[PDB]
Amino acid sequence: VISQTVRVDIEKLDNLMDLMGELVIARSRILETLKKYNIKELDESLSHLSRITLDLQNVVMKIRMVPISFVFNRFPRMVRDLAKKMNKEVNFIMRGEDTELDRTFVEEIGEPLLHLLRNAIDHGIEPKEERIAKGKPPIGTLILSARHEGNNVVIEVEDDGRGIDKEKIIRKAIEKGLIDESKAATLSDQEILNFLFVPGFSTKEKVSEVSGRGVGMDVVKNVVESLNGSISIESEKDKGTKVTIRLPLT
Amino acid sequence: KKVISQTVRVDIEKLDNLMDLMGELVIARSRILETLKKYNIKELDESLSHLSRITLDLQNVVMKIRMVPISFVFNRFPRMVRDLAKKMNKEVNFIMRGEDTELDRTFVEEIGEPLLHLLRNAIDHGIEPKEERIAKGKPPIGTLILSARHEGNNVVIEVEDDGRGIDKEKIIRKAIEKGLIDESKAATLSDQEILNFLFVPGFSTKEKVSEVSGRGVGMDVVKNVVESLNGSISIESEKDKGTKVTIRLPLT
Ligand SMILES: Nc1ncnc2c1ncn2[C@@H]1O[C@H](COP(=O)(O)OP(=O)(O)CP(=O)(O)O)[C@@H](O)[C@H]1O
Ligand SMILES: Nc1ncnc2c1ncn2[C@@H]1O[C@H](COP(=O)(O)OP(=O)(O)O)[C@@H](O)[C@H]1O
C-alpha cells in the first residue's frame, strides 16, 4: 500500500524552467546550423529530437497548471472591504474556482480582475435606495466566473448595475480627434465600448507614470494581450455590464 | 507590479515521464551524432556539447525534486508492527531513527515491502519469547530499531533487533546438504559468505523453488528488489546479540 504525491518548491520549478528555455534555444541553433544539409534521415534524427523537447516541455506545462483559486480566494474579502468603503451593498459570487491555468497566467491575471471587480462595485452598482426605486433587486449581484470552454479559458465579470453610458463615450471620442458624428452612427455596440481600452480615455485625469505600464482599463487589455488573450465588454443602461476575458489554454 | 500566489505540488505520474523523456533525450542526441558519422559533419559539436550540459543539468534537478523524506513509508510501520507483534504474542519496543532522511520517491514504495519483510522477520524469528529471553539473561524487552541516514552519496537503511541472532551453523550444514559446499570449503567461509546463502533463491526455504513462480516471499527477492534500484544489501548477526540488516541506495 502506497502514500502519494509530492511537494516541490518554486526555485526548483524556476531552475527547471530556466533550463527548459535554454533547451529550446540550443535545439533551435542546431536546426539552424544543419539547415543547409538536405540529408533524408538526418532530418528524422533532428525531428525526433524536436519531438522529445516538445513532449518534454508539454509535460512541464502540465506541471505548470495551477487552480485559479490562488487568486480568486484573495477576492471575497477585498470585494467585501471595497463594498462598505464605498457605501454599497453587493452580493458577490465566485464560480469555477477549480478551473486550472498556467502558473504564469494566474499570477498575471490577478490585478486586472481586481480592477474589473472594483469597477463593478464603484461605477457599476447603484446605491441600494436607487435600485429599490427603479424596480431592481435591492442588492446588486457581482459574478466572477472562470470556466474551461473550448480550447480557451473564459473569465467573466458581470454585474447588474447602472451599465455604461455609450453616448458619453461617443461624445468624448469625438471631443478629441477619434471619430466624427458621421462615423459615430456606424459603430456597433462593442466597438463603442472598445474605446475604454484606449490609453487614458479621459474623463479622469493625467497620471505621472512610474515603475509600471499604466493605471486603468488600457492596462487590463495590455495584460490580457501579453497572455495572447482577448477581451471585450457587453452593457446596456440600467441592466448591467459583463466583461469577458478569453485566454489560450495550454 | 506582479501579483503573488504560493508554492505548488504535483504527482509522480508525469514526474517519471520527465525522466523517461529525458532518458530518451540523451539518446536523441547520440543518434544525431551517429548519423553525422555516416555523412561526416563535425563543425557542430559546440552546440551538441551544451545539449549534454543541459540534459545533465536538467536530469539532475528533474530528479532533485522527487526526493521525499522516508516518513511517508516509515509512519505506516509502527502499527503494522504492534498488531502482528501481539499476533505472535511478543512484545516489541519499536524505535525509528533518521525518519527525516530523504531519497527518491520511486524507491520508497518498492522498498516498502522489503522493509516490512525484514521487520516481520525480526519479530518472528528474530525476537525470542520473553521466557526464553529472561532465561538468556537479556532484558525482557525486545527492541526493534528501524533506521535511515545519509552516508556519502548513499542512503543507509538499517533494520536492527536484539534476538537469538542467526544460526550460521544451520546455514552451513544446510548448504552442505544441498551440495553447494562441503566441510573443507565451509571451514574457510567468512561471516559475509555464510549469510549470503540466505540470498540464494532456493536456500532459506524448504518449499517453493522449481515450478511454483518467479515471484515468491523470501530474502532472495528482497535482494533483487534492492539491486533493481542498483543498490546493495548486507547482513550482520552475532549469536544471541541480534540481527542487523543494511540496505544502501544511490542518489546521483
Ligand atoms: N462595470 C462598470 N460599470 C459602469 N461603468 C464602468 C464599469 N467599468 C468601468 N466603467 C466606466 O469606465 C470608466 C473607466 O474605468 P477605468 O477602469 O479606466 O477607471 P478607474 O481606473 O478610475 C477605476 P477606479 O475607480 O478603480 O479608480 C469609469 O471611470 C466608469 O465611468
Ligand atoms: N532478523 C532475523 N533474525 C533471525 N533470523 C532471521 C532474521 N531474518 C531472517 N531470518 C532467518 O532467515 C530465514 C529466511 O527468511 P525469509 O527468506 O524472509 O522467509 P521466511 O521468513 O518465510 O523463512 C528464516 O527462516 C529465518 O530463520
Swiss-Prot record, chain A:
Domain (Histidine kinase): residue spans on this chain: 1-250
Subcellular location field: Cytoplasm
Function statement: Involved in the transmission of sensory signals from the chemoreceptors to the flagellar motors. CheA is autophosphorylated; it can transfer its phosphate group to either CheB or CheY.
Listed name of the protein: Chemotaxis protein CheA
